[PDB]
Amino acid sequence: KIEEGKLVIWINGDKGYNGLAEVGKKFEKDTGIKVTVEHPDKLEEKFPQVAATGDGPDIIFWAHDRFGGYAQSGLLAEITPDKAFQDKLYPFTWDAVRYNGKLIAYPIAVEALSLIYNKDLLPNPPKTWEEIPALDKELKAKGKSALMFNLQEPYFTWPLIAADGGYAFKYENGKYDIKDVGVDNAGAKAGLTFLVDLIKNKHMNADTDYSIAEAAFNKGETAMTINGPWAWSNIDTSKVNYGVTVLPTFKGQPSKPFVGVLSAGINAASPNKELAKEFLENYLLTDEGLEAVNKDKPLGAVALKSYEEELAKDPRIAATMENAQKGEIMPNIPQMSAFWYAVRTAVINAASGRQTVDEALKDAQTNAAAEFMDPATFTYQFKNVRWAKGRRETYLCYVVKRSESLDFGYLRNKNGCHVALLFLRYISDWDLDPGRCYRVTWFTSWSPCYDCARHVADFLRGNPNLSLRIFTARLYFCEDRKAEPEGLRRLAEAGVQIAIMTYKDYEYCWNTFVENHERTFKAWEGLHENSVRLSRQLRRILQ
Amino acid sequence: KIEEGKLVIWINGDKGYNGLAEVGKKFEKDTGIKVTVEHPDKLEEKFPQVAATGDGPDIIFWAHDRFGGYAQSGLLAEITPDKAFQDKLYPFTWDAVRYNGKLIAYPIAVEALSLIYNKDLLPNPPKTWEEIPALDKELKAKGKSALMFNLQEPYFTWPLIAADGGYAFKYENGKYDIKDVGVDNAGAKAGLTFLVDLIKNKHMNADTDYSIAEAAFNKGETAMTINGPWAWSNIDTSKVNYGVTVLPTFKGQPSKPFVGVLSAGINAASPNKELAKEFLENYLLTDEGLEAVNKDKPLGAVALKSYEEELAKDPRIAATMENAQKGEIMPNIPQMSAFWYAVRTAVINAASGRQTVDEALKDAQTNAAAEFMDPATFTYQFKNVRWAKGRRETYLCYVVKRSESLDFGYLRNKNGCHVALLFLRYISDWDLDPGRCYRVTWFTSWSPCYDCARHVADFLRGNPNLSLRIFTARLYFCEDRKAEPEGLRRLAEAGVQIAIMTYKDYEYCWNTFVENHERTFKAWEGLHENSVRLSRQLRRILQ
DNA sequence: GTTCAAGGCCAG
DNA sequence: CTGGCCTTGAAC
Ligand SMILES: Nc1ccn([C@@H]2O[C@H](CO)[C@@H](O)[C@H]2O)c(=O)n1
Ligand SMILES: Nc1ccn([C@@H]2O[C@H](CO)[C@@H](O)[C@H]2O)c(=O)n1
Ligand SMILES: [Ca+2]
Ligand SMILES: [Ca+2]
Ligand SMILES: [Zn+2]
Ligand SMILES: [Zn+2]
């Protein structure tokens, strides 16, 4: 499917591909290996599919966060560049290409938020958030705002929050801890409450989105806005005289934006891994290669030290690199999705004032965080055998998705409330945006009883955006051959996909919800026999 | 429009009207004069309009504060009850129905804040505010707060503030002094700093509102709350065992809640003024009449001495009357509105810590306190004639309303700062809530110049909730007769209603902003002639 | 003395 | 087979 002696490179349309193609022409001139660069559409989507088939490009350029998902699917070769080459680039950029303890791509370019101020309105920008209210009151008298940015999305408000002891997941020796989230913290609450103190006094109306702040800053209304290089071009045509500089410091500590690293990764299916490493290390990652790419379309800051020094002569790019070094690498692991969501609401609720700060942040932390089951508890509660009728507690492992896999976890029995009802209360306390459907998956020790089938099927009638599937280990009946079969048929009428957990489902649960301590799943005796038994009884019930 | 030999009575819906109707039935049984009681909606709003047309009710029941606004519009008949009858009611209640030196209504009922405590948690309530922090530390150990009330509104926090030499306006014999405000005082600062000392140690979280404190007290969390009789019914259904007692004393002096007096006023347009006085003096204001009204819906404490003694057997009502006698009558004059606002913010800014105490209180006092303009200075500075070009200070009288007339005053020239810019700095230092529009009115010696016009029109672009109208005595100029006209046309574009002061405007200013010593306005020669002349030049300028 | 995981036997 | 019922070894 994929050739030898030929290099195929995939790069997005907004990044300069003509300069990269000219680099490949230099590589072909010197070596004889012909290089072809392509800028397809949705290549961040196209690449996983074509690569799962042993096809696709030899090299893939994209932001480093997606590369973690590519690395979990084994689509990326491991690279071991000499430490003599690892120096050549800034050290923190090599951490963005590290997944599960091994390097999966080459750092190329750097992006991060930075402070954009009006030089005419502000000849000397403030170095601290603490000076912002005062400044605003002086500029609210000329009909101007001091600062406006995209307060809705968490990528923009997060730097102030994380400036003081705030973080998503602690990093260590090239691996994140999904169990630990610094969303709830003294300093995170300090930054968020400072934000709220700005919006209460209406230094920021709190309804500000990206376009309201871009229209505001670009038409001369606001003196400062927090944004990245992606928008620079616009401000250059607005004729506004401006500048980029360090994001202000809260409590004296630098604020921490989320750094995105444009990276070049190697397809694991490629026979040209070494050809690729030679091209990347000796032709792309040079002053001449990155400059040739840059003249076509900007790269922002670059990871290559020498060329980054040549580019820092631009004060804007210098600011980008400075805020990047004072910030934190945007994590590449899956749980980050559940993070964004769990934060995207928590700031908004604390912004409008419809929820207090510590409530929004505690709810955010416990939402986007790990809770893992026990192994002995799981093995005991989920055994599908005979003689399992003597089990009382029902356990329920859940996954909420849309495909963005949001929160996951497990619930158990508590004071007469069967688990299904507790999940109804959990997903009800959790707000919903009924313009988008959600796909909710259940893994239950016992299938729902009649009361649970009726309550759940009703909840499903009322929120028709939700679509539920239920995998149960065991079929529950009290007063056999009357009620629960009709209840399960009632959930069937409501369109609930009811299956009985097969072996692959027990693997999924074992590696998804349980704390296995890297232990392989161990099937007990009679698992498959009881599974096709119970699935037979179920096919007898519904149909 | 309004009948003779018939009495029509207006009373709010929350006050017992069936008992009052039975009193009117007794009056009809004795005299033959039929009495009809009605409880319309927004009768406090409906009454001024219907009465301005010589219509409406014969008698109106409402809190005494609104009656001052009815008295200024001449809608209330003056009453001269014999001293023998005035001795029947408590003397301080007669000061609440006194406006501009003459009685306008009959006192009926009395309301005031009182201390409500949990008898189970607190068998012996503290008599002094000084004991409150210690008691809180003892109850913070059982999971309870000692005291929680509505710290947002000034009606609730004012008793402690005024406990030591604090007051709104000094009252010399039924007459308030708008020029004197005791908001800034040694004892006022003592009470406010003690409140801040309670919120720094978090004996009160300072975000507490009326409903947070009612839910807290009624669910058993807090041991004491400061409230009035309006909420008693709720605490009765909460099954909480409680009591009402004296508000605690600060520095040994009784704290001063604001006393509200439910009053019965006579419509000045009624031919039945004497029928009304007979019904009120001999049928309503009796033990039998007030008891008949009370059995239907409670009146709280009453102004009639004998029946008040009969009701004091209820220790709650006795507490209400005691705090009322130790408090001060809530003034009925218009400036009280500027008072509430100027105080509502001043305590909040001193509560959060975003403004020091003496700053919040000095800003509050100078905010809500009259400030009046020398007659000679006004007459000199506002003369519209010719030969007025030789005047170089510019004065500006302002009114800020929403309807709701907040602060008024005048402003003048400074070291190169024209007035308009000084007013921009004043209304900027004054905070704004950009969810509500404000209507600001100007009265200026000179119309704004080009720099003024531009700065003001910009301020209006940035704060689009403000709507400005400018009345000017004179039109200003400087060579570029071109400009002073284009600047005024730019303010016209911004939506500023520009008019030139007519005679009625001079009357308004003369009786609103000037210290006239009760002297009628004296127009100089050529006022009207120069007025239509300048108005002609202005029409010629804008259109 | 007791409660439970597990498994087998027998009668529908 | 599916469901009902005893035996057991072994664990608090
Ligand atoms: N869907 C279901 C059905 C049943 N159960 C368990 O069975 C008992 C009902 O009497 C309950 O004690 C309950 O533990 C459950 O947990 N979930
Ligand atoms: N709109 C205006 C215009 C002018 N002025 C006062 O009049 C003088 C004009 O030179 C100036 O000295 C200035 O003080 C003013 O007070 N307000
Ligand atoms: Ca969770
Ligand atoms: Ca004032
Ligand atoms: Zn159930
Ligand atoms: Zn001016």
Give the neighbor-by-neighbor strand order of the sheet with B497-500: B408-411, B396-401, B438-446, B466-474, B497-500
Contacts of B327 (CB under 8 A, 6+ apart): B112, B113, B159, B255, B256, B257, B258, B259
Sign of the dihedral defined by the CA atoms of residues A289, A293, A296, A297, in that order: negative
Contact A110, A320 (CB under 8 A): yes
Buried b (16+ CB within 10 A) or exposed e, A455-464: bbbebbeebe
CA pair distance B112, B114, nearest whole angstrom = 6
What token pair was written down for B127?
């008599």
Beta-carbon separation of B462 and A144 below 8 A? yes
Give me the half-sphere count of Cα atoms (radius 13 Å) on the Cβ side of residue A344: 14
Looking at the DSSP assignment, which residues form a beta bridge with residue A179? none
Name the residue among B506, B510, B526, B530 with its Cα closest to residue B518: B510
Which residue of B354, B434, B458 is in closest CB contact with A143? B458
* Phi, psi angle pair for A105, to nearest 5°: -155, 170
Name the residue among B469, B526, B521, B518 with its Cα closest to residue B492: B469
Query: What are the helix (H) ranges across B385-471?
Result: 419-429, 450-462
Taking CA atoms, what residue in B is nearest to A143? B462
Nearest nucleotide (C1') to alpha carbon of A534: D2
Instruction: Using alpha carbons, list the distances in angstroms from residue A417 to A393, A395, A404, A450, A496.
Output: 11, 12, 30, 14, 21
- Amino acid at the residue B1: K
Name the residue among B531, B538, B475 with its Cα closest to residue B503: B531
Name the residue among A105, A94, A191 with its Cα closest to residue A151: A191
CA pair distance B33, B541, nearest whole angstrom = 65
What token pair was written down for B464?
């689009």
Pick the CATH number of A375-542 from 3.40.1190.20, 3.40.50.2020, 3.40.605.10, 3.40.140.10: 3.40.140.10
CA pair distance A381, A385, nearest whole angstrom = 11
**Residues of chain B numbered 354-413 and touching chain A (CB < 8 Å):** 354
Contact B285, B304 (CB under 8 A): yes
DSSP state of B246: P
Instruction: Using alpha carbons, list the distances in angstroms from residue A258 to A113, A166, A324.
Output: 7, 12, 8
B455 part of contact set with chain A, CB < 8 Å: yes
Q: What is the DSSP string of A506-531?
A: HHHHHHHTB--SSPPP---TTHHHHH
CA pair distance A288, A292, nearest whole angstrom = 6
Ligand 1, atom 3, lies closest to the CA of: A449
SS (H, E, C) B486-520: HHHHHHHHCCCEEEECCHHHHHHHHHHCECCCCCC
Where chain A is broken, by preceding residue (C–N > 2.5 Å)? Answer: 402
Contact B531, B382 (CB under 8 A): no
Buried b (16+ CB within 10 A) or exposed e, B530-541: bbebbbeebeeb
Instruction: Using alpha carbons, list the distances in angstroms from residue B500 to B369, B385, B485, B535.
Output: 28, 12, 14, 6
CA pair distance B500, B471, nearest whole angstrom = 5
CA pair distance A72, A99, nearest whole angstrom = 8
What token pair was written down for B482?
């071109």
Looking at the DSSP assignment, which residues form a beta bridge with residue B384? none
Contact B494, B457 (CB under 8 A): yes
A451-CA/C2-C1' distance, Å:
34
Contacts of A215 (CB under 8 A, 6+ apart): A221
Helix/strand/coil for A58:
coil
CA pair distance A136, B455, nearest whole angstrom = 17
- Amino acid at the residue B66: R
- Amino acid at the residue A187: G
What token pair was written down for A83?
């430490």
* CA A268 from centroid of its chain's CA atoms: 23
On the 0-12 / 13-18 / 19+ scale of CB atoms within 10 A, A219 is exposed
DSSP state of B203: S
Query: A258-266 and A328-329 as β-strands: parallel, antiparallel, unpaired?
Result: parallel
Place of tokens 């120096």: A87
On the 0-12 / 13-18 / 19+ scale of CB atoms within 10 A, B366 is middle
CA pair distance A308, A108, nearest whole angstrom = 11
Ligand 2, atom 5, lies closest to the CA of: B394
CA pair distance A220, A351, nearest whole angstrom = 25
- Stated as kind and residue range, the H or E segment containing B70 is helix B64-72
Chain B residues whose beta carbon lies within 8 Å of the beta carbon of residue A143? 458-463
CA pair distance A424, B346, nearest whole angstrom = 46
The hierarchical CATH code for the domain B114-258+335-367 is 3.40.190.10
Contact A398, A338 (CB under 8 A): no
CA distance B204 to chain A (A): 17
What ranges make up the beta strands (E) of B11-58?
Answer: 34-38
**Would you report the helix, strand and coil content of chain B in percent, each value rounded to 5?**
45, 20, 40
Query: What are the helix (H) ranges across A174-272?
Result: 186-200, 210-218, 232-237
Taking CA atoms, what residue in A is nearest to B352? A197
CA distance A137 to chain B (A): 7
What is the interface size between A and B, counted as CB pairs within 8 Å? Answer: 28
CA pair distance A488, A208, nearest whole angstrom = 48
Instruction: Using alpha carbons, list the distances in angstroms from residue B161 to A248, B203, B254.
Output: 40, 17, 11
- Stated as kind and residue range, the H or E segment containing A542 is helix A527-542
CA pair distance B323, A153, nearest whole angstrom = 52
Helix/strand/coil for B40:
coil
Which ligand has an atom closest to residue B407 CA? 4
CA pair distance B352, B207, nearest whole angstrom = 8
Mutate to test the interface with A, among B349, B354, B456 (most CBs of A within 10 A): B354
Q: What is the DSSP string of A119-183?
A: TTT-SS--SBGGGHHHHHHHHTTTT-EEE---TTSHHHHHHHHHTTT--SS-EETTEE-TT--TT
* CA A94 from centroid of its chain's CA atoms: 19
Sign of the dihedral defined by the CA atoms of residues A286, A287, A290, A292, in that order: negative
Instruction: Using alpha carbons, list the distances in angstroms from residue B178 to B92, B184, B339, B366, B432.
Output: 21, 15, 10, 12, 24
DSSP state of B231: G
CA pair distance A538, A489, nearest whole angstrom = 10
What token pair was written down for B501?
């002061």
CA pair distance B461, B447, nearest whole angstrom = 19
**Would you report the helix, strand and coil content of chain A in percent, each value rounded to 5?**
45, 20, 35
Contact B255, B34 (CB under 8 A): no
Place of tokens 């990093």: A171
- Amino acid at the residue B184: D
CA pair distance B384, A491, nearest whole angstrom = 86
Name the residue among B456, B445, B436 with its Cα closest to residue B497: B456
SS (H, E, C) A264-275: EEEECCCCCHHH
Helix/strand/coil for B169:
coil
Helix pair B336-352, B357-367: axis angle to 10 deg: 170
What token pair was written down for B228?
């009035």
On the 0-12 / 13-18 / 19+ scale of CB atoms within 10 A, A256 is buried
Mutate to test the interface with B, among A130, A140, A219 (most CBs of B within 10 A): A140
A130 part of contact set with chain B, CB < 8 Å: no
Beta-carbon separation of B432 and A202 below 8 A? yes
Helix/strand/coil for A482:
coil
Experimental technique used to determine this entry? X-ray
Contact A266, A277 (CB under 8 A): yes
Give me the half-sphere count of Cα atoms (radius 13 Å) on the Cβ side of residue A375: 12
SS (H, E, C) A311-362: HCCCHHHHHHHHHHHHCEECCCCCCHHHHHHHHHHHHHHHHHCCCCHHHHHH
Beta-carbon separation of A202 and B434 below 8 A? yes
Contact B191, B256 (CB under 8 A): no
CA pair distance A400, A419, nearest whole angstrom = 16
Give me the half-sphere count of Cα atoms (radius 13 Å) on the Cβ side of residue A26: 17
CA pair distance A475, A385, nearest whole angstrom = 11
* CA A113 from centroid of its chain's CA atoms: 17
CA pair distance B282, A91, nearest whole angstrom = 95
Chain B residues whose beta carbon lies within 8 Å of the beta carbon of residue A137? 428-429
Nearest nucleotide (C1') to alpha carbon of A537: D2
Q: How many CB atoms lie within 10 A of CB B29?
A: 8
Give me the half-sphere count of Cα atoms (radius 13 Å) on the Cβ side of residue A530: 18
Q: What is the DSSP string of B302-343?
A: ESBHHHHHHHTTSHHHHHHHHHHHHSEEPP-STTHHHHHHHH
Torsion of CA B476, B481, B482, B486, to 10 degrees: 10
Please provide the distance, in angstroms rounded to a whole number, between the alpha carbons at the two ends of chain B: 46
